C-alpha cells in the first residue's frame, strides 16, 4: 500500500487508511518540511504509531541528511514494547517490498533492572539496587582489579563487551527488550550497554521520558550527536507533570535522618581509607584542583572549579552544615512557607554557606564518593538526593520554589514532615529538548486544546491541527448525564459531595447501566476518599448489593499489590460472562498505566469532574505562578487540569481495531460549554446536543439502543 503523499511516496503495511490518516501524514510532513517543532493530536491509541513511524521512515529515505534519527518516546515500558512490534512489522513489510536488507537500525532502551543477564542482580527488583549493584561490578576499581584477575566476582558481560562490542557494532535489525536480552546472553554482552553504544549509529531509538527529560541521565545518552533528529513524544499530554517530577525533589525527616546516618558511615569510611590507602586516593585532589548524575542541564551546568570544598573532610563538614540547616529548617512548626530565593540567602546568612560552593556540591559528591570505593550507591542514595537538592537550589530559583510542610495532609498531627521543592513551570526543564533538537513532535491522544501547551511550554508551534477519527461506523457514542430520575443537579461539587441524593443518583445510574452494559465496565471517581464515601453510602443502602447481584464489583486501593491482583481478576471476569465493575481513581496509576480494548472497559463511566483538592499547597505555586507568568487564569488551568485528566481516563475504550464502546460522564458539569470545548475534538464532534444532558433513565435507553447497532457486523 504505497501512498503517494504530497511530499513524496510513502509505503504502508496495512491495506487501507482512514481519511484522518491522510490529514495526519500531510500535516506531519508539513512540520517536517518546515523543520520546526510542533504539536498534533490523533484519536486512535494504535494506528497513529504506524502512520507516524511510516512517514518518518519515508522522509528519512528522501532526506537522510535532514533527519539524523528518530527518537520516539512512550510513557511506560509495557507500552513502548507495543511500539517496537509496530516498527518490527513495518520493517518486514518494507524489507519484503525492497527484497533485501537496508542499513536501518531500530532498538529500545530500558533500565538495567528491566533487562540484565547477571544472575546476582536478577532476584532483586528494586531499581536502585540494580544501579548500585551494577556500578560496583562495573566500577573502575573492579575493572582495574579485574585486570589483576584477583579472586573476586567480576561481571564478565561488560568486560567482554568492551573487548568485542567496542570493535564491532551490530550491523542492523530490530530488537525488542525481551528479544534484546537473548542476544546479550548468546554473545556474552550487555543487552543494556550494547544498546547504549548503538545510539551513536541508530536510525530509531525509543525510551520513556525519564530517559530523555531528567538532566541526570537524559543528557548522557541524548548528547549533541542528535543535533537534527526527529524527537517524538507519544500520548505525552501529561508531559508537564512528568517534566516537573524530573525537577521536584522531596526532603523528609526520615530521609534526612537516613542522610545523617549515612553521612556518619562516610566519615568512618574516610578514616579507614586514610590509614589503609591515602597517597593513591589522594590523587583525586590533584585533578580536582585542575577541574547519580548532576541535575543541571547543558548550559546551566558548570564545571569551573569545585570551590572551597577541595577535600573530603572539608566537603563532609559542608554537608553537615547544610544538612543541619535543612534539619532545623524542617523541624520548624508553622504554616506552609514559600521562599525560592530567600532560602538560599537565609542558608548563606544563617550557616555561612555561599551559593557558588553549594552549586558544585552534588557534582563534587559523585567524584568524592567514587574515591571511597563504596560497596554501592543504594545505601547512600538518600544523601545524594539531598545533594541534588543541595546543588539544585543553589543553581536557580527564578522559576522554582521551596515549600515546607511541618504537617502532612490527612493527619491532624504527624511527626514526619516533608519539605517540597516542586517546580512551577515545565518550560525550564524541557528547554534543551526544543533548543537542541531541530523539531519535536508532541503527538498525543485525548489532548486538551493545544492552545494552552505553547503557553505552558515556551515553544513556537508550526502546526496546530486536531484530527477527528472517521469510520464507516460510529464506534464511539459518548454521552453526558447531569439530571437524575429526580431531575436534580448531579454535579460532584465539593459542597455538593456530601449530598446523599446526588450519591443515590450515581448508584442508581450504575445499577441500571450495569444491567444493560455487557461484560466489562470501569467507573472512575475523583479521589480515594470520595470513592470510599460513595462506596460506603451505597453499601448502607441496598443499591450496592443489587449491583453485586447483576455483575461482579472490583475496587482500587493505593497499594500496588492489591491493585494488580484486583485488575488481574478483573480481566478474567470480562472474559467470562460474570462481568466486572472496576472502581478506580482518575489520578490512580492504574488509570494511566492500564489500556482498555475490545471487551475490556466497554463503557467507561466518569463519576464527577476530576479535580485535585484545592488545599494541596504544591499546586498553588504551580498554579498561581502560571497566572503571573504566561498569563493563564487559575480557573482556566484548573479546568484544563480536569478535561485533560478526564480525557486521559476516557479515551482508552477506542484503543483500536474499531471496537465499539460508549463513554458516559456522570456529571452535569461536562454539559457546560467550557468543558465541552476543552474536550478533545474527536470526542466532542460525535457528541450532540440531543444527548448532551440525557436523564439517568433517558441515558440508559440510548445506551441500550446504541449497543444493539454495534453488535451487528459491519
Amino acid at each position: 500500500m504505497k501512498l503517494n503523499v504530497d511530499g513524496l511516496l510513502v509505503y504502508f503495511p496495512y491495506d487501507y487508511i482512514y481519511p484522518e490518516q491522510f490529514s495526519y501524514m500531510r500535516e506531519l510532513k508539513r512540520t517536517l518540511d518546515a523543520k520546526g517543532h510542533g504539536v498534533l493530536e490523533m484519536p486512535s491509541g494504535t494506528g497513529k504509531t504506524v502512520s507516524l513511524l511510516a512517514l518518518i521512515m519515508a522522509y528519512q529515505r528522501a532526506y537522510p541528511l535532514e533527519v539524523t534519527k528518530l527518537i520516539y518516546c512512550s510513557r511506560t515500558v509495557p507500552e513502548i514494547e507495543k511500539v517496537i512490534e509496530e516498527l518490527r512489522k513495518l520493517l518486514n513489510f518494507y524489507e519484503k517490498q525492497e527484497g533485501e536488507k537496508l542499513p536501518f537500525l531500530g532498538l529500545a532502551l530500558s533500565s538495567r533492572k528491566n533487562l540484565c543477564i547477571h544472575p546476582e542482580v536478577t532476584p532483586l527488583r528494586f531499581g536502585k539496587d540494580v544501579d548500585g549493584k551494577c556500578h560496583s561490578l562495573t566500577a573502575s576499581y573492579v575493572r582495574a582489579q579485574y585486570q589483576h584477575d584477583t579472586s573476586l566476582p567480576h561481571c564478565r558481560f561488560y568486560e567482554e563487551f568492551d573487548a568485542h562490542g567496542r570493535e564491532v557494532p551490530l550491523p542492523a535489525g530490530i530488537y525488542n527488550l525481551d528479544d534484546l536480552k537473548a542476544l546479550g546472553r548468546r554473545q556474552g554482552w550487555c543487552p543494556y550497554f550494547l544498546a547504549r553504544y548503538s545510539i551513536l549509529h541508530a536510525n530509531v531509538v525509543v525510551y520513556s521520558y525519564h530517559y530523555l527529560l531528567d538532566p541526570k541521565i537524559a543528557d548522557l545518552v541524548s548528547k549533541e550527536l542528535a543535533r537534527k533528529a526527529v524527537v517524538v513524544f507519544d500520548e505525552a499530554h501529561n508531559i508537564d507533570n512528568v517534566c516537573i517530577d524530573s525537577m521536584s525533589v522531596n526532603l523528609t525527616r526520615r530521609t534526612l535522618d537516613r542522610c545523617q546516618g549515612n553521612l556518619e558511615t562516610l566519615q568512618k569510611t574516610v578514616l579507614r581509607i586514610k590509614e589503609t590507602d591515602e597517597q593513591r586516593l589522594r590523587d583525586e585532589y590533584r585533578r580536582l584542583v585542575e577541574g547519580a548524575n548532576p541535575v543541571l542541564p547543558d548550559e546551566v551546568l558548570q564545571e569551573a572549579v569545585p570551590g572551597s570544598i577541595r577535600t573530603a573532610e572539608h566537603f563532609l563538614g559542608f554537608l553537615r552544615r547544610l544538612l543541619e540547616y535543612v534539619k532545623w529548617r524542617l523541624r520548624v512548626q508553622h504554616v506552609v512557607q514559600e521562599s525560592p530565593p530567600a532560602f538560599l540567602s537565609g542558608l548563606a546568612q544563617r550557616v555561612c554557606i555561599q551559593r557558588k560552593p553549594l552549586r558544585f556540591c552534588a557534582e563534587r559528591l559523585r567524584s568524592l564518593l567514587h574515591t571511597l570505593e563504596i560497596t554501592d550507591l543504594a545505601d547512600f542514595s538518600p544523601l545524594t538526593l539531598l545533594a541534588n537538592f543541595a546543588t539544585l537550589v543553589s543553581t536557580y530559583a527564578k522559576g522554582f520554589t521551596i515549600i515546607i510542610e511541618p504537617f502532612d495532609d490527612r493527619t491532624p498531627t504527624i511527626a514526619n514532615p516533608i519539605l517540597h521543592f516542586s517546580c512551577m513551570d515545565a518550560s525550564l526543564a524541557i528547554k534543551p529538548v526544543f533548543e537542541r533538537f531541530q523539531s519535536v513532535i508532541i503527538t498525543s491522544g485525548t489532548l486538551s486544546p493545544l492552545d494552552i501547551y505553547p503557553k505552558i511550554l515556551d515553544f513556537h508551534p508550526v502546526t496546530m491541527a486536531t484530527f477527528t477519527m472517521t469510520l464507516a461506523r460510529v464506534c464511539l457514542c459518548p454521552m453526558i448525564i447531569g439530571r437524575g430520575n429526580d431531575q436534580v443537579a448531579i454535579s460532584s461539587k465539593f459542597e455538593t459531595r456530601e449530598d446523599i441524593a446526588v450519591i443515590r443518583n450515581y448508584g442508581n445510574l450504575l445499577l441500571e447501566m450495569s444491567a444493560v452494559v455487557p461484560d466489562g465496565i470501569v467507573a472512575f471517581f475523583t479521589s480515594y476518599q470520595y470513592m470510599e464515601s460513595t462506596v460506603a453510602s451505597w453499601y448502607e443502602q441496598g443499591i450496592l448489593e443489587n449491583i453485586q447481584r447483576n455483575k461482579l464489583l472490583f475496587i482500587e486501593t493505593q497499594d500496588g499489590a492489591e491493585t494488580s491482583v484486583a485488575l488481574e481478576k478483573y480481566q478474567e471476569a470480562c472474559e467470562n460472562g460474570r462481568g466486572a465493575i472496576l472502581l478506580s481513581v482518575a489520578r490512580g496509576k492504574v488509570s494511566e498505566g492500564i489500556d482498555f480494548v475490545h471487551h475490556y472497559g466497554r463503557a467507561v463511566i466518569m463519576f464527577g469532574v476530576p479535580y485535585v483538592y484545592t488545599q494541596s499547597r504544591i499546586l498553588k505555586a504551580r498554579l498561581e505562578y502560571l497566572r503571573d507568568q504566561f498569563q493563564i487564569r487559575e480557573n482556566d488551568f484548573l479546568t484544563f487540569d480536569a478535561m485533560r485528566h478526564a480525557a486521559q481516563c476516557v479515551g482508552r475504550a477506542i484503543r483500536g481495531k474499531t471496537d465499539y464502546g460508549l463513554m458516559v460522564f456522570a456529571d452535569k458539569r461536562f454539559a457546560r460549554g467550557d468543558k465541552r470545548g476543552k474536550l478533545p475534538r474527536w470526542i466532542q464532534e460525535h457528541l450532540t446536543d440531543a444527548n448532551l444532558n440525557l436523564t439517568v433513565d433517558e441515558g440508559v435507553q440510548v445506551a441500550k439502543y446504541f449497543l444493539r447497532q454495534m453488535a451487528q457486523p459491519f
Binding site: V289, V305, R310, E313, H314, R321, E324, W328, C352, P357
Partner: protein, 149 residues
C-alpha cells in the same frame, strides 16, 4: 527540640520544647533550666567537663549537633577575615584557593591548637586590616541592604 533531653535534667524537654540550646566554648549541650543550675555554683563552669567560662559563655542556638555549634560559631569569626571578594584576584586558581585555607583554619581551630592560627591571623591582620577588611566590611551593609529588597 527532637533531642531526648539534657544529659543531667532530661525532664523539661519532654514537657515543652521551648528551651533552646546554649552555645559554649565547650561546644556542649545545655538547657535554660540547666543554665540556672550552672549559675548558682561555678557561674560559668560546665557541670561534667568543668570547662571555665569568662561570663557564662552563653548564646542561644538551635542546632542539635554540638560540633556544628563550634564549627558555625568559629566560621562566623573567620569570615571577618579573608572577606575580600573573588573578583579582586584575576587568577583562576586564586579564586577558591584562599577559601581552602580559610576552611583549613576553621577545621584547624575546631580541634587542633589555635596558637599557630592566632599567630598566622596576626600576620594577615597587619596587611588586610588596612584596605580589604575595612572596604569589604563597609560594603557588607550596602550589598545586604540591596539584597534584602
Amino acid at each position: 527540640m527532637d533531642d531526648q533531653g539534657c544529659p543531667r535534667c532530661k525532664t523539661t524537654k519532654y514537657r515543652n520544647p521551648s528551651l533552646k540550646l546554649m552555645v559554649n566554648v565547650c561546644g556542649h549541650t545545655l538547657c535554660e533550666s540547666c543554665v540556672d543550675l550552672l549559675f548558682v555554683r561555678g557561674a560559668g563552669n560546665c557541670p561534667e567537663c568543668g570547662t571555665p567560662l569568662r561570663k557564662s559563655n552563653f548564646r542561644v542556638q538551635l542546632f542539635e549537633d554540638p560540633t556544628v555549634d563550634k564549627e558555625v560559631e568559629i566560621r562566623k569569626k573567620v569570615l571577618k577575615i579573608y572577606n575580600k571578594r573573588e573578583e579582586d584576584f584575576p587568577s583562576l586558581r586564586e579564586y577558591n584557593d584562599f577559601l581552602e585555607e580559610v576552611e583549613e583554619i576553621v577545621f584547624n581551630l575546631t580541634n587542633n591548637v589555635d596558637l599557630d592560627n592566632t599567630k598566622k591571623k596576626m600576620e594577615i591582620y597587619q596587611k588586610e586590616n588596612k584596605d580589604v577588611i575595612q572596604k569589604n566590611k563597609l560594603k557588607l551593609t550596602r550589598e545586604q541592604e540591596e539584597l534584602e529588597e
